Nucleic acid binder design. Sequence first.
RNA 1: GCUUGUGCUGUCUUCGUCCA
Lengths: 93, 549, 268, 98, 105, 174, 64, 171, 84
Amino acid sequence: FGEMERDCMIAHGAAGFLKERLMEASDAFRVHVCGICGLMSVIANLKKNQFECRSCKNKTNIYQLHIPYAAKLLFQELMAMNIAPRLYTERSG
Amino acid sequence: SQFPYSSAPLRSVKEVQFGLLSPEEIRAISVVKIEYPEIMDESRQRPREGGLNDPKLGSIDRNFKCQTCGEGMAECPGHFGHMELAKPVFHIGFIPKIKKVCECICMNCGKLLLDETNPTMAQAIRIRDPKKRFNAVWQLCKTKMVCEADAPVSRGGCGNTQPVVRKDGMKLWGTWKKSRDAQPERKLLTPGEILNVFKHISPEDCFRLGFNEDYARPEWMIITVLPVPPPQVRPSIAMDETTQGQDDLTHKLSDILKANINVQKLEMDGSPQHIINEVEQLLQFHVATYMDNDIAGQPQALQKSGRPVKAIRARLKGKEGRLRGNLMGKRVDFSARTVISGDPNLELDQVGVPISIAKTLSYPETVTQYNIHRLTEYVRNGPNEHPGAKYVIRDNGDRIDLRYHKRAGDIVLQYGWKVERHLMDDDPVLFNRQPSLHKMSMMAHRVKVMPYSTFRLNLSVTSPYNADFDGDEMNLHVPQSEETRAELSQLCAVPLQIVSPQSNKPVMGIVQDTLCGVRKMTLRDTFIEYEQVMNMLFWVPSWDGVVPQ
Amino acid sequence: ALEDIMVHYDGTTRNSLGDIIQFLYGEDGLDGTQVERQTIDTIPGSDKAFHKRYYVDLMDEKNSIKPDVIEYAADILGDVELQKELNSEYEQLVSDRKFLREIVFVNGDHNWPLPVNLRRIIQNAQQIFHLDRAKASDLTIPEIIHGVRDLCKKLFVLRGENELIKEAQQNATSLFQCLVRARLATRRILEEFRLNRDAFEWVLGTIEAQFQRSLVHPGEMVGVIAAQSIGEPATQMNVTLGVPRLKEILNVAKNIKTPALTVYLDRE
Amino acid sequence: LKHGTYEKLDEDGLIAPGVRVSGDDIIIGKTTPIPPDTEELGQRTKYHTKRDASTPLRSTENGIVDQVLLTTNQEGLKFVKVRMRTTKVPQIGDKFAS
Amino acid sequence: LYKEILNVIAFDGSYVNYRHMALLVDVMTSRGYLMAITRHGINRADTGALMRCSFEETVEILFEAGAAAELDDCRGVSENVMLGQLAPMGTGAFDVMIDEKLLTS
Amino acid sequence: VSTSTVGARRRRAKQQVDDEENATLLRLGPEFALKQYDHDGNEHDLIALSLSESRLLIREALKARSRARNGGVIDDDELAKVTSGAVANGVVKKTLDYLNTFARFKDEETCTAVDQLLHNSSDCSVLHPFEIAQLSSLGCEDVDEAITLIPSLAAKKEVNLQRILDELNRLEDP
Amino acid sequence: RDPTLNKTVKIRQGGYKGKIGIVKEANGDRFRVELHNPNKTIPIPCSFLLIESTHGWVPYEDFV
Amino acid sequence: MFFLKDLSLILTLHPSYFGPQMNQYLREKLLTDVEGTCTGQFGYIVTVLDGMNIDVGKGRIIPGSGSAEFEVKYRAVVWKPFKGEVVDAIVSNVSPIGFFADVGPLNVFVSTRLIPDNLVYNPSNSPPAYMSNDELITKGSKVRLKVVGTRTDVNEIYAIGSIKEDFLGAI
Amino acid sequence: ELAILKEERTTTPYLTKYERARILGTRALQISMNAPVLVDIEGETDPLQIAMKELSQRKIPLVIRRYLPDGSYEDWGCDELIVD
RNA sequence: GCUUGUGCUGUCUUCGUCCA
Ligand SMILES: [Mg+2]
Ligand SMILES: [Zn+2]
Ligand SMILES: [Zn+2]
Ligand SMILES: [Zn+2]
């Protein structure tokens, strides 16, 4: 599903179909993010039910996101080049 | 519902804040320190701790679990490590920016060469945009070549003359006009010295330069500690049945770590300055070509085969890069492709689908009291007969593969379960031909299951697709949800696309032998007898049963 | 370049930053699939033909409405209030003719894409209400005048009571109101189309409903549609022209291949 | 092992000419040795010492085995070639030209 | 600009509706000066870094965004596409709430 | 699970010493700071509650809920059993027992008089609400005892602590 | 596991009478048999088969 | 110490409950999910004031799943211990390593290393107790202790007290 | 604050095509997940057809929140928007 | 008494198919 097909689906106005194509029919992934630093550095043990961002030293302000696996890979490669992409779930102003 | 339960609330991303990573943050988010170049412990499995494939960095194996989060390969995202460098080095992407900042400030007392007393400087301060603010401040302070001990009343200036800094390779040279003519000396500006100078810059001066005290600090452009990506970023491959080859990034990190140990041992034992310079330039070259191997004006880092090293930068650019190749467009599931054929006996919004393609593709239908009997009939039919089904999905998400189930005839369906039934008649599907020049290249059709291995189209839709039947192929996409089916059937359907907004005229018409025949049949001297008239009238689906006089 | 441009619920066209690109999409706020070529009847012709077609004089007996087309033909001559209404209609038509001929279309072109096909609506009304036969019409002239005048103030492109909103709304429907007034003229309705009361009310309601249905929908990604609509002809295609000239225009090249001036001289 | 069948192989690990083959069926049986696990704790005849490296037929193809070749390579190890034969009848969607 | 584009399009007999070229030249002249449809025109805007990097000069744009501590508000379609979210366009330009008042009936 | 009305608090670089919870230093953290915000965003003060005030509030709320659930038609056990959840029932039973066995003021009017004395007093206009709650809860008898148990009151020597304690003992039912 | 998997079989009834095949899938009575000449696999009930043995063709019941 | 706090909860409702009784069902679900819970950030939530008149607002339909998400804001009474605070307690169990007390729902453990030496544990006593010449502390005896450390769990709080300072011990 | 009072609503009173598609999809999904139906179904079984029947009779219990570019919004009931 | 096994490389190069 190339870029031109994406533009055609934008021109149709079908946002739900585009989201389903690019996530459910492809690399859908779930990550946890700290609510303070906004980094994907949470250490989650789901069956032990314990979450922790060791850097920010917090256990309660943690969320889960559904993002493409390629987006996760891109953010990790950016982090490898010392760039800090921080994902926040609220606006500031 | 394909992910195991987590008590963390589910939210979406509203803002992305960019910035640089501080050494404190790199040390804090790390789970282990990488200091051993050897990948394998003793060539007897169980990779060495503190190495580039430490088991705390994450698990990329089916039977092994991550020692940091305890999750399996499917769920573990990978964890970062760090690698302390013996000497600081430049980040290859920020060297011109470091040069411009060095021009902007004073190399001895870390202060801007000009203050707000100059009205032009105040105007340069006023602009909110950090890039333009930095550009203006740089355009001003570049001219100023001497720190002012007193106000042009002491501004804290040390009075020293500002050198001329020129870039060559990754090395900056600061030419001081030491005290008409004299003998000027150009001395190397080592990364440690610039780092120390940047570290003394006040927060307010940092803000004046367009940097941010919290996220983007000027001394963080110098690498003192290197984050180590998890194995998920740099997976190993299986070249043959036995030997497995390491990724390019792993080899480059091994080279960096060897150079670091070399620098450290050399400094500790005995220090001829020339040898220090050689080995430290080797370390700088390795760190620079680990991130950018397309540096102009110097040779590329090569593999043992002679092919150049694949750097991180080259993973993100081009058609096959991360952005264009895996985010703006990707390969998707639930799709089909085959040759297309014409069918005069199909409706305008119908598509003929081969039986094998209908058996392969599926739609997950929710079991309700309106369809439970039909769905259990489909489940009894099985994955090899049409109309059948391929999977039964429980509420908890466990799939039941109907191929390898010995009691598929004894499966009882509960409300709320999902059945992945075969593609059936009148299911909306998206149909597409490349290149997709306009929005009429993707339209939603209705499925009709037919024999033989081609897709079948009404001939009036061949114009918007720009298709013919001399070998062309077209793609088909199956929606997987009720909302997505409604979107396809109410927005992208073929009848809704008859008139195009480009020229406010139709894009579909009568073509080919239908056009020739309608010209021939409507000539003034064409007459038809009663029996043929009855046949032609019965051929009309919308005919009301009344024969005209 | 155009991917993030969308029509919003206030009618404006904006990008992802909220910067306004157009205060109304297409300067008329209409969808590109809802317009057809129609002729504006006040633009062409001579002054004699325009006067003969549109002027109704209730004093002179040979330049009035025909007596076999209206049942009230007797008590019509000599009225002054009705003559004032007819004069107001004619002055509005003359103003429309001046406006179109002097500001909008100066070369006399009068076949332009507009919404709501009026000819189709009129012939549909004629077919539905059986407007054939020489039967006189019961449609009074003030009814025609007030119906057309009220119709020309219910074509809502923008909603609101602010004065700027009203000015923009009046601006957006100028050409369409000119078309409607040129077609639904009193003499034309009474003689050429021969509508009655029921047909007239049906035509007014149909015009209003169809104009409401021709507006662009908020949420449209008109930028991508414009990009595809411009790039599609480029696929199928001494002054440089074609694809190199399109490249020169889109790149804003400083040195074009064939610079040229178009110099116009004074009349003499 | 793979999901395909192995009953069409002979003692020498090679299929014989004249046998019907469907997709994924195994036509060449090959194994490579592997250092045994702690299964010497006691597994009389069921301790794994080999890993399967067999060659399956292409999933989209089927036909008849036409000829099986056995020889030795330049180095000196065994070397096999299996040829499959099938008939293709024209149908809807096949390309022709003058 | 509209006259030149119309000349180029209409020379070979083709026809394009006015609103498309009007939107194009309005984007090309909205900033007070001529903005070319190139990286020098498009990528010198105030849009988000993620939206600009996906066109051209990806790594340079990301390095500049990191050094400048840019904040992407994720309002464009490209950011939501590459984050796997419902883009604020078409059917995603509004929200759907549950009408408790009507449900009483 | 439940989220406070205070949000944001993003990453920075400075570290402060007024971050650890400490009753003696009167550092109650951000979520229990002296300044709070309601659902309307208006200014709001931290609301401490003594055992008398807490007992009155829990009894009032529980009896209101019990009356509402019964169609608008005193025992602690039945009132605890009104609530749902076995662990919730155990928690409310433990709180009811703790409050009952340490109730300094079981009367509404006595609690009202205590609250008015501890609020409208000029000396108490500077006292932190946590200090007020601790004084009304622990039932101290001596200034030295109160200072030892509550170190924050040592720095506030402009408070007529002894007479306030004697008034509290007088109001306390023997 | 059925004793008829990967065994040569002959069809005795229906539209494919007298065609030699091999049993590939056998779950509940609907044996999947590939046909030697037509490159296809067809479903068939166990009643319509004839399993080869060392002494001629045997019916399904008389073999299991 | 007890406090009044303005709390919020996110409640997700399945479409099968989209009926006229949606508001009351959400209220009872909120009560069952809030009353008696223990969150380390806040402490212990004991009761919710005005529990039958809580505004729930309008729920937002989650795209792709149909279920509505509700934001419910409420005021509740919350109790949380603090480091360095002196509170009363009741001894619940006696052990050689120390004694376990109960402060409402919270259980506080005090080790012998934080107990004065004269309060020697007597296991022969009926019931077993930590007794001195003039003091005798056993099960059910009123004790005044000072909270020194607090341990936070996923949905539990563990506190550690001490009685080695003045104005502590038996009361 | 961001909410706009019902008397001064200035957006179009007609249901757009995107809103119609999204409302039909959401209602069909809810019906397929066992939500109560507010219209009498004669013999209809398909959730989308039932949703369309509900829409034609103005019985869909959903609210559309239309967002303005500045951040404010208007709330419109599905029963007070004109549908063609 | 006897029970059926559960998956796949990477990187280049060349030749092709349908549009343009
Ligand atoms: Mg072709
Ligand atoms: Zn964090
Ligand atoms: Zn892990
Ligand atoms: Zn200086």
